[PDB]
């Protein structure tokens, strides 16, 4: 999903996430590609409190 | 036996010095000791627990040892694991502990007795330990905390000034200064949500009991405080503590009193025992109906309770009933056997139903056991479409009932159309919340009805006083005459940017509706408006176009009720003729042509077109909407302050349409404008009389032109106003005008005058006459062509022309000099920080701004060193452009008029030179301080995408030059290069 959201769009912003769960799938997109660009924040939302 | 008082006599202090606030605290302690509260003083936590043990052993009638009380305090009362929300849930739900004794019998430790008041016991104390607090223990539990603040300090700033163990229980925070008094709901939020929820206790006529003294003498009664804190408070799942409005509590207790007295008088199945509440539209009527239904269920002799709704509002309001557990209010599996099985169900007997499911129950069953039982119905969505035979069968197929009404459309004998009135069906108007009460609450805003004398030609038709003859004169000769609609359109397209505060292109502004009559009317309307906007574009080739939308489907379907309302059209597009079908498809293709959408001509495409049209008008894009039969009641927008009307609207169809204006948005939107073309001021005054007295139009609508040019000493509330010309004389005389102000007291007095001047000028900007007086500065001498164009687009004869040439305004560039002086006073004491006495006004001078584009048009227009000093004051004329002085000055000084072949080229030349200066001074100011140049440019594009700068976001601390995590450091030049870069982006905001 990281290599499908990427690439060629080096523009504001990344990223948004409904049903975030954990930040694992949020991680390896920009954690590998922080040197590509920094744009803005990571936007999550989730239900379960300990999962939150 | 109430708590919201009808006949209260307002008491009076002596004084009893009202200046120092500890005196007010002593007065409050003395008053509560006089009312019947009890004062002790505890400066520990141990005697708190001792008093709680005392009160609980008094209440529940048992005696703890140290073992039982230790176990109760540890396990149930004061676990440190327990949160504040846990405490509030214990207050409003878990108010009983089940306690094991030593001999193993289970008993109930009550906390607050929710069934009797004399059992409940309160005490009062103060705090420990720089502030003034009054803490009201309720059975030893701190629930009501009153804080006292300074007098001259406003309550808005007093709002924003936010171990130990048992203070977690606090429910109500009442803040005051002695003159004003508001009350919180458990200290939730900050200045963004400050004055949405901080209510004010009032009498039954909604007149605000404002002080500390009468608020104590009315709200701080033990009966009143316990009745509010228990029987009118909601801890709603989840996270939220809802406190009711005062008139809501009023109407609830009036309803319960009428039910109890009618059961005492044995008054069932009779409309004299009924009654109705008329709230205004748009205040959150869900919670009042919820509380009324639940308290109707809490009585023992009441057999069944039903809150009947209308289509198709059942399903979402079902979940809104479900917001607190549990009303059990559903029967979606629609039947009468399942419904009578639900009738046989105990302990949760409120069920939301429609009137159609109820009529199915009527005409499907005739022998229910409920037909001779104490059943109370409460109605809502009171348009009279689905009403008639339901009442006859409810009289027929019942022998015991009550029924009450939550209406929005009260029907009087003032409006007959053969219809059955409200008091005939329901009875006593038990309590009402009217729009004048709402304006007195400052929840909504005022009006201004403006009949237009544009034509003496069709004047008698526009003032025709017979609606039947208006139906007889309904043709294309008397009202849809082409010159008539043309001269309406000329007025509209002249004054749209005037009324919507679009005087500068850098102003945000608002949008407008356009009330029309009928289908064949509206087709000819939009054809005329489209053709005349095409001709207005053809006039000068500089006129910016004004986007028009419109909608209607079908039709004026019924009359349906009394006088006289909006025929809410059904969504059948094909039900028209061929002509309006083709015209509607043409308008839909216009929308699909400019806005590039895919809306069809079925009901679904019409639905989505309607909703996307509502959204696109809702976010200030489509500037004018022609309104036929929708968007008048079931619609809201905070950003529409102008309404143009050609439609014979009557009594409260007048008011529900005009309530599309009065919603607040900011300080600049003071009130909405109603510009009409048929005379409806008589119907306005008739609706005023329908609401009540003649003091209504003193408060609600408007005062005249001279009464805001010269002011007024008010008779409604007693204020005294000076209008305009007194303020003009105080400008021109009392001060070293216009930028000759250099001392602090002169600055403060210039702020105190000039902010009021700006406010009164923004009030006068809603007027035709003040706009004509400002536009008199832009005429020619003599030139009867241009002055004929002036007086022809303003309808001013030569008499008023010379009469307003007699009246002389101050020079407008000198007014710009006054604004520049006010801006200097602002920016000289905006940084650090007598000066912090009056709020420097923001919301209106933030508008009327030039973003240098009109200044570049001035540079490309002045031909010619004659331009070299023009912008030097225009820079300080507009706030937000002070560091951008040297940029524009060096652009116009390095180049000249040789760089500008026309208007548009100097803009792009300024962009090119500005980006050159951007990169040049960027490398010059990074080079001087040794920032890491890739991280430096990354922070440059950061602060230019973010459009300001801050030291938050530690990548700026990773944009450190070499080293600053160390404690032996000034953090300088970190803050100094920070000042340099915020000055840099202040020079280079919005460019490149």
């Amino acid at each position: 999903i990281a290599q499908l959201a990427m690439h060629g769009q080096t523009h504001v912003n990344k990223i948004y996430d409904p049903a975030a769960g954990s930040g694992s799938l949020l991680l390896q997109a920009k954690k590998q590609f922080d040197n590509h660009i920094i744009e803005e924040g990571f936007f999550g939302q989730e239900i379960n409190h300990t999962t939150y | 036996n109430f708590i919201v008082l009808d006949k209260y006599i307002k008491a009076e202090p002596t004084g009893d010095s009202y200046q120092s606030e500890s005196d007010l605290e002593r007065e409050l302690i003395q008053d509560l000791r006089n009312q019947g509260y009890e004062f002790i003083s505890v400066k520990s936590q141990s005697a708190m627990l001792a008093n709680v043990r005392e009160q609980l052993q008094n209440l529940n009638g048992v005696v703890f040892n140290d073992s039982e009380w230790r176990r109760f305090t540890e396990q149930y009362l004061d676990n440190p694991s327990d949160g504040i929300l846990d405490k509030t849930r214990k207050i409003h739900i878990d108010y009983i502990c089940d306690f094991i004794f030593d001999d193993e019998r289970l008993e109930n430790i009550y906390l607050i007795d929710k069934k009797n008041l004399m059992r409940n016991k309160v005490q009062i104390i103060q705090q420990f330990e720089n502030r003034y607090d009054v803490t009201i223990l309720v059975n030893g539990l701190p629930l009501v905390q009153i804080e006292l603040k300074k007098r001259g300090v406003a309550i808005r700033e007093a709002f924003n000034q936010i171990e130990n163990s048992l203070f977690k229980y606090l429910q109500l925070f009442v803040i005051s200064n002695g003159t004003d008094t508001r009350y919180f709901a458990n200290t939730t939020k900050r200045d963004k949500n400050s004055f949405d929820f901080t209510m004010n206790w009032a009498k039954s006529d909604n007149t605000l009991i404002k002080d500390l003294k009468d608020f104590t003498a009315t709200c701080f009664q033990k009966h009143t405080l316990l009745n509010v804190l228990v029987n009118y408070s909601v801890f709603d799942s989840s996270q939220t503590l809802l406190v009711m409005r005062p008139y809501q509590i009023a109407a609830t207790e009036r309803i319960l009193w009428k039910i109890k007295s009618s059961f005492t008088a044995k008054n069932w199945s009779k409309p004299e025992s009924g009654g109705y509440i008329w709230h205004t539209t748009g205040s959150g009527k869900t919670l009042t109906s919820f509380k009324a239904a639940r308290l109707a269920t809490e009585l023992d002799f009441i057999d069944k309770v039903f809150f009947v709704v209308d289509r198709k509002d059942l399903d979402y309001q079902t979940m809104k009933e479900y917001q607190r557990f549990s009303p059990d209010s559903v029967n979606g599996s629609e039947n009468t056997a399942g419904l009578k099985r639900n009738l046989d169900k105990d302990d949760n007997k409120i069920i939301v139903t429609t009137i159609q499911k109820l009529n199915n129950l009527m005409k499907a069953e005739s022998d229910l056991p409920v037909y001779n039982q104490q059943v109370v119905f409460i109605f809502d969505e009171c348009h009279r479409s689905q009403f008639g035979e339901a009442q006859k069968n409810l009289k027929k197929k019942f022998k015991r009932y009550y029924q009450f009404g939550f209406t929005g459309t009260p029907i009087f004998p003032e409006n007959a159309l053969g219809s059955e009135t409200t008091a005939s069906v329901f009875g006593r108007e038990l309590h009402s919340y009217v729009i004048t009460d709402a304006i007195r609450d400052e929840k909504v805003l005022k009006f201004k009805v403006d009949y237009n004398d544009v034509r003496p030609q069709f004047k008698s038709l526009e003032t025709e006083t017979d609606e039947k003859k208006l139906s007889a004169a309904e043709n294309q000769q008397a009202f849809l005459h082409p010159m008539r609609i043309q001269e309406i359109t000329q007025y509209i397209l002249n004054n749209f940017r005037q009324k919507t505060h679009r005087t500068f292109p850098g102003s945000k502004g608002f949008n407008a509706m356009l009330a029309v009559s009928s289908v064949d009317a509206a087709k000819a309307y939009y054809a005329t408006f489209k053709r005349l906007q095409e001709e207005a574009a053809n006039k000068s080739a500089t006129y910016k176009p004004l986007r028009i939308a419109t909608i209607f489907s079908f039709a004026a379907n019924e009359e349906q009720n009394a006088i006289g309302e909006i025929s809410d059209e059904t969504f059948d597009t094909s039900a028209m003729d061929s002509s309006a079908k083709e015209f509607l498809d043409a308008a839909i293709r216009e929308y699909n042509s400019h806005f590039k959408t895919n809306f069809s001509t079925d009901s679904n495409g019409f639905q989505n077109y309607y909703r996307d049209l509502a959204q696109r008008v809702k976010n200030q894009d489509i500037d004018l909407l022609i309104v036929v039969g929708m968007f008048l009641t079931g619609f809201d927008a905070p950003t529409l302050n102008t309404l143009f009307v050609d439609k014979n609207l009557r009594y409260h169809g007048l008011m529900q349409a005009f309530s599309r204006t009065n919603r607040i948005y900011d300080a600049t939107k003071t009130f909405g404008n109603i510009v009409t073309f048929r005379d409806l001021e008589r119907s306005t005054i008739d609706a005023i009389t329908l609401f009540g007295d003649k003091n209504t139009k003193n408060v609600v609508l408007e005062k005249s032109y001279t009464e805001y040019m010269e002011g007024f000493t008010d008779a409604a509330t007693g204020e005294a106003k000076r209008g305009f010309m007194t303020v003009v004389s105080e400008l021109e005389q009392r001060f070293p005008d216009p930028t000759s102000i250099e001392s602090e007291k002169e600055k403060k007095d210039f702020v105190k005058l000039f902010g009021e001047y700006l406010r009164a000028e923004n009030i006068l900007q809603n007027y035709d006459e003040f706009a004509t007086l400002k536009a008199l500065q832009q005429i020619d001498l003599s030139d009867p062509v241009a002055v004929e164009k002036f007086k022809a687009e303003h309808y001013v004869d030569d008499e008023k022309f010379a009469e307003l040439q007699t009246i002389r305004l101050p020079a407008d560039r000198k007014i710009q000099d006054y604004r520049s002086a006010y801006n200097d006073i602002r920016d000289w004491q905006r940084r650090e920080k007598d000066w912090d006495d009056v709020v420097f006004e923001v919301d209106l001078l933030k508008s009327q701004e030039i973003n240098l584009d009109y200044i570049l048009g001035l540079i490309f227009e002045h031909n010619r060193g004659e331009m070299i000093e023009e912008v030097k004051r225009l820079i300080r004329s507009s706030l937000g452009n002070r560091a951008k002085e040297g940029l524009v000055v060096d652009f116009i000084q390095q180049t000249n008029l040789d760089d500008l072949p026309d208007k548009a080229s100097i803009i792009d030349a300024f962009f090119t030179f500005a980006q050159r200066e951007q990169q040049r001074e960027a490398e010059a100011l990074i080079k001087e301080e040794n920032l890491n140049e890739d991280a430096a440019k990354r922070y440059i594009r950061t602060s230019l995408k973010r459009e300001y700068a801050t030291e938050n976001g530690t990548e700026l601390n990773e944009t450190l030059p070499k080293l600053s995590p160390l404690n032996p450091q000034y953090k300088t030049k970190k803050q100094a290069v920070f000042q340099k870069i915020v000055s840099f982006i202040e020079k280079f905001k919005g460019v490149g």
Binding site: - | D98, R105, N108
Partner: protein, 52 residues
């Protein structure tokens, strides 16, 4: 006991299992009716549940 429908409160049975298990004399076969307990979560929920 069923005539007092929805009678606040629950623990009338907890007393009403005390004295029929008092019964000391003789050959007791008491110490017996400790099945009925107090969970449940909240007191009105317990009242409604045991009443039903």
């Amino acid at each position: 006991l069923n005539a007092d429908l929805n009678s606040i409160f629950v623990a009338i049975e907890s007393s009403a299992y005390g004295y029929p298990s008092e019964a000391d004399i003789k050959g007791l076969f008491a110490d017996f009716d400790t099945t009925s307990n107090r969970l449940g979560n909240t007191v009105k929920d317990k009242n409604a549940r045991l009443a039903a």
